[PDB]
Write an enzyme that holds these catalytic residues in place. Structure first.
Site, mmCIF file in Angstrom:
data_model
loop_
_atom_site.group_PDB
_atom_site.id
_atom_site.type_symbol
_atom_site.label_atom_id
_atom_site.label_comp_id
_atom_site.label_asym_id
_atom_site.label_seq_id
_atom_site.Cartn_x
_atom_site.Cartn_y
_atom_site.Cartn_z
ATOM 1 N N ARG A 1 24.596 96.543 66.492
ATOM 2 C CA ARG A 1 25.130 97.584 65.473
ATOM 3 C C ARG A 1 24.691 98.730 65.320
ATOM 4 O O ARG A 1 23.767 99.258 65.802
ATOM 5 C CB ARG A 1 24.726 96.697 63.977
ATOM 6 C CG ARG A 1 24.983 95.129 64.062
ATOM 7 C CD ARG A 1 26.459 95.027 63.745
ATOM 8 N NE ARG A 1 26.691 93.345 64.011
ATOM 9 C CZ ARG A 1 26.205 92.566 63.023
ATOM 10 N NH1 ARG A 1 25.597 92.937 62.066
ATOM 11 N NH2 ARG A 1 26.624 91.348 63.070
ATOM 12 N N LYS B 1 20.616 93.699 59.084
ATOM 13 C CA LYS B 1 21.643 93.101 58.292
ATOM 14 C C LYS B 1 21.089 91.715 58.077
ATOM 15 O O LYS B 1 21.126 91.007 56.922
ATOM 16 C CB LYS B 1 22.894 93.329 58.742
ATOM 17 C CG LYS B 1 24.114 92.481 58.269
ATOM 18 C CD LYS B 1 25.561 92.764 58.702
ATOM 19 C CE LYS B 1 26.428 92.147 58.103
ATOM 20 N NZ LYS B 1 27.839 92.473 58.731
ATOM 21 N N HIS C 1 32.420 100.738 65.378
ATOM 22 C CA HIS C 1 31.733 99.486 65.286
ATOM 23 C C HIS C 1 32.778 98.481 66.030
ATOM 24 O O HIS C 1 32.119 97.454 66.638
ATOM 25 C CB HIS C 1 32.094 98.879 63.846
ATOM 26 C CG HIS C 1 31.442 97.416 63.470
ATOM 27 N ND1 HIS C 1 30.006 97.160 63.751
ATOM 28 C CD2 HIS C 1 31.729 96.226 62.960
ATOM 29 C CE1 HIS C 1 29.843 95.850 63.590
ATOM 30 N NE2 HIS C 1 31.026 95.372 63.127
ATOM 31 N N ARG D 1 31.420 97.241 69.241
ATOM 32 C CA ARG D 1 30.507 96.038 69.415
ATOM 33 C C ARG D 1 31.475 94.931 69.973
ATOM 34 O O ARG D 1 31.162 93.995 70.525
ATOM 35 C CB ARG D 1 29.778 95.785 68.109
ATOM 36 C CG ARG D 1 29.536 94.445 68.015
ATOM 37 C CD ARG D 1 28.947 94.178 66.519
ATOM 38 N NE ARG D 1 28.676 92.851 66.158
ATOM 39 C CZ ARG D 1 27.599 92.232 66.691
ATOM 40 N NH1 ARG D 1 27.018 92.639 67.591
ATOM 41 N NH2 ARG D 1 27.700 90.649 66.238
ATOM 42 N N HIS E 1 24.390 87.128 66.809
ATOM 43 C CA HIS E 1 24.991 85.847 66.066
ATOM 44 C C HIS E 1 25.155 84.553 66.335
ATOM 45 O O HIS E 1 24.891 84.423 67.795
ATOM 46 C CB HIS E 1 26.835 86.506 66.188
ATOM 47 C CG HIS E 1 27.526 85.710 65.259
ATOM 48 N ND1 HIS E 1 27.509 85.373 64.096
ATOM 49 C CD2 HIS E 1 28.759 84.786 66.000
ATOM 50 C CE1 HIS E 1 28.398 84.666 63.755
ATOM 51 N NE2 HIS E 1 29.144 84.074 64.869
ATOM 52 N N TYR F 1 36.389 86.979 66.886
ATOM 53 C CA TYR F 1 36.101 88.265 67.108
ATOM 54 C C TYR F 1 36.427 88.372 68.720
ATOM 55 O O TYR F 1 36.027 89.348 69.445
ATOM 56 C CB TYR F 1 34.371 88.220 67.292
ATOM 57 C CG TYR F 1 33.875 89.653 67.166
ATOM 58 C CD1 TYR F 1 34.192 90.391 65.955
ATOM 59 C CD2 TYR F 1 32.735 90.194 68.087
ATOM 60 C CE1 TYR F 1 33.511 91.817 65.999
ATOM 61 C CE2 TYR F 1 32.334 91.222 67.800
ATOM 62 C CZ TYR F 1 32.663 92.144 66.883
ATOM 63 O OH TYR F 1 32.205 93.525 66.773
#
Lengths: 55, 356, 274, 345, 54, 53
Positions: free
Chosen positions: B212, B235, B308, B311, B333, B342
């Site tokens: 991130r 996060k 972002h 990523r 994740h 994603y």
């Protein structure tokens, strides 16, 4: 995005005459004022007539 | 009283009066004093009329087609103030609490000052849909959710008995954030020459680590031990160790090779520092990445990608490069729901099928 | 005042007209609303009891149409939920009921059955056979198979834009089913020689055909073959289900999913030694 | 009564209230008081006549709509008394019963003694939050859960009809007890020198076996067959057998050596006894472990680790020494329920 | 949504003469004021009467 | 949407004098009750003369 003289007036609360709208432009009753491009005027998206008078 | 009615208040609202100097002043139902506001008539009355949004002072209310059910209670604008005193005790990170306040503020300038059992479901929908017509659909969803939990905590404190907000539906966003391919990647990195040097290094470092942008500006040269890159996400809180042997052939970028470049050119306590040898914010990094985007001249469909998005591009590349399970542990994740949401394209590239 | 059920259902249809959905989709809901009209009296919403709602619902469940009851119950509920939003009533007497669980009774299609239908499609025109092999070699849905133009084929590919979901894929002209004896290439070229039109699948008049006639004529060849099943006889859409079932044992499972147009995952497993 | 009839009442709206300064004030038939309605004559009367008549429906064959009539009930405290009796027959550990009665006494000094059908959701929240702002977060969660259970069983009998406690929200708190390390245990181990001998042996035996302090005091030498260590957990009741072969290579403490040191120094029926050669309570083994904390001179972030942390330390050591399935098969764990090295895989 | 002086008077409890409608605007008896746009007032969709007295 | 005093009494079976009808207003003998516009009363189309006692 810039609307024309006719397009702008065609989106107001009450459509007026082309010559009428031209009068406001000369009386600065259009905030913000349109921009000269070619031969016609280009108004802003959030352009709305105002009253520059305090009675 | 001494003066019930007059030939001066005859053209003035209940609050606000007029002195012997032709000036007007609005009273204060909290002390009995007043401040001078206005020299004109149609101005002091047109000013002492919106505070006058609350004559409860006589008048009642009723729309077209509706029922009746009420009695007596208190204000509500104040409840929005007591609700904030409860959220600050729920133990929340210093960033999420601000996200709630901004929404509560929107509720303030959205709904009229009103008791709590007065604001009908119809009134909440008029304000909610108002943001939808403007395009801001993702906002109406958060405003509704927040305004929903506010009444829930209200009912648990003996004030309301129902949750009118639960009656109305929530907008359904579509996420119009275009992705970034590998070709458009080089197009931006090439235009990042006019921008500082730390930009290109952090741009490749954000695609080689797939971390991130926030944690990308938190890594120091002390977090690297035995060839590993200890990174602690803020996060979620997940902890991972990235090997300094990674490499992206689709872009020709080596992990170790990129790291060393930040040790000579940049130099500092953090992997990615500024020209002044100091750590930067997470809002300035993705900020300059935009400049190179617009200066590029490339066009997309919808909303231009972001820093972002690197990523995401990092995950898609590592997929075909090594494996799928590899582009899952690196992104910090887990679960099995976002790993697929994603990898999609969202109307950009055709999902070509090969003989395999 | 201004109450009543019907009066609301009229102001409810316009609401769904601004929801922004597919054309056919909006029609499906309308057919459900009309059923509610002749299913419940014309009286205020606050007067409608949960009993009358279940009396009409179960009435469609006993008739055999359990599936219809689910949609009508799920649609009628949405109307009231939007009715409360306007401030009409206070409660949704439909959220107290229970949807009837319906089990799919549409039998599947096998390899032997397909061969028996293709041969029985002789009496049928010369485009049905082509539509069959194509629907099984591409594994696409009947809806898009009719909107396929020869311009979609680009350098050995087959650009297909699914209407239902909207997924975009490209099926190469190199596929071939190893169980029925059909080749993607040989099938496409067979349509360019016999048919000959703007669309891969056209009529005898060299003009596009509707998706309602492709599966309609397929039914005639189904009952004409003389094959018995258990439940409801398979349809043209089953060719899509048969396609994947074959490609999963012909190539790979990850291939069948990508061919159909799926993205996410969602019988006799083997117990390995390890 | 004193007035019966008079002028200013000939307006007709019941519960009227025209004072001297021409100001109506509708009266409430619950307290007798009244609030200023309006300053008009044909305005206040309208706001008074609509109250008298209670409307709701609209055109029908004789409606109903109830909103009165009620009696027969019980009081909170009284019901809370027999409530404890029902709990004593529920069949549970004596210790568990005490922790429930402790919450009961809190409710007594937290809520008035009025009919159970008068307690408003507001009153309940006023007491709950009163313990949340005092830092007693976790406490307002057990008291709320126990209180809610006293109402459900009340409805089961036929006392009340609704559980106003099922409307409030249970606070979610975060653990404050810090985690013990491997470097701080060595320090405390040295600060325990001023303390008796059994303290040292208790510490080592609580990190090598990873057993609860409550069961550590119930360990007998007869529970050692050949090379095992039968320990019947008292908490849940999980049966396990720890082999006398384990040893912490992170602290240099073998279980075999530790056990032998408890056979010569201590000497008794229990592996962990006192200087008097007799069993010690579970509240004494942890109380003196504390004396070593403040004596060591180690500050933590929040609440100082306890003797129970020795168990957590035992698991966090074996988790890296041998395996993870081993740690879960030592503390007494059954099912599964800080940096993962991500290799190229 | 804004309406005219004629369209507004049509959607009220009781439609009166145009003269009376213009009077209320001049006397400022409607929240919020119409605001003259050219040569014809434009009422707001929520602009209702208030009425004063002495 | 409403009806004037005359337009309401004219529809009645026994149209009484204006005064008498105005009296049934101050005596709340008419329910649903009429509202005062400016100088006249506009009853409801369903408003009836509820004669009690």
């Amino acid at each position: 995005m810039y609307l024309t003289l006719q397009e702008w007036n065609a989106r107001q609360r009450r459509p007026r005459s082309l010559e009428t709208v031209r009068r406001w432009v000369r009386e600065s009753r259009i905030f913000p004022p349109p921009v000269k491009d070619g031969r016609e005027y280009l108004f802003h998206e959030s352009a709305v007539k105002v009253d520059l008078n305090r009675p | 009283m001494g003066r019930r009615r007059s030939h001066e208040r005859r053209d003035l609202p209940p609050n606000l009066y007029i002195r012997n100097n032709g000036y007007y002043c609005y009273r204060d139902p909290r002390t009995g004093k007043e401040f001078g506001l206005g020299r004109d008539r149609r101005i002091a009355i047109t000013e002492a009329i919106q505070a006058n949004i609350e004559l409860f002072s006589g008048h009642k209310h009723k729309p077209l087609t509706a029922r009746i059910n009420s009695d007596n209670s208190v204000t509500l604008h104040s409840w929005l103030d007591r609700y904030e005193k409860i959220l600050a005790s729920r133990g929340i990170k210093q960033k999420t609490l601000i996200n709630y306040m901004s929404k509560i503020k929107a509720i303030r300038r959205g709904l009229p000052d009103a008791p709590l059992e007065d604001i009908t479901t119809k009134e909440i929908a008029a304000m909610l849909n108002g943001y939808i017509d403007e395009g801001k659909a993702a906002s109406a969803k958060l405003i509704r959710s927040t305004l929903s939990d506010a009444f829930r905590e209200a009912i648990a404190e003996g004030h309301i008995t129902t949750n009118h907000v639960a009656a109305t539906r929530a907008a359904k966003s579509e996420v119009r954030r275009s992705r970034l391919t590998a070709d458009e990647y080089l197009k931006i990195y090439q235009a990042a020459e006019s921008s500082p040097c730390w930009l290109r290094l952090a741009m490749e470092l954000a695609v080689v680590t797939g971390q991130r942008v926030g944690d990308l500006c938190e890594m120091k040269w002390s977090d690297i031990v035995d060839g590993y890159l200890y990174v602690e996400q803020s996060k979620t809180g997940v902890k991972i160790a990235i090997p300094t042997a990674l490499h992206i052939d689709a872009l020709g970028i080596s992990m170790k090779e990129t790291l060393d470049k930040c040790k000579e050119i940049l130099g500092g306590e953090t992997i990615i520092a500024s020209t002044r040898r100091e750590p930067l914010s997470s809002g300035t990094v993705s900020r300059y990445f935009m400049r190179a985007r617009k200066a590029s001249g490339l066009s997309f469909e919808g909303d231009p990608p972001t820093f972002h998005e690197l990523r995401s591009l990092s995950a898609r590349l590592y997929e075909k490069q090594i494996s799928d399970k590899f582009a899952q542990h690196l992104l910090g994740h887990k679960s099995d729901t976002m790993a697929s949401q994603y990898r999609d394209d969202r109307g950009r590239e055709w999902d070509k099928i090969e003989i395999k």
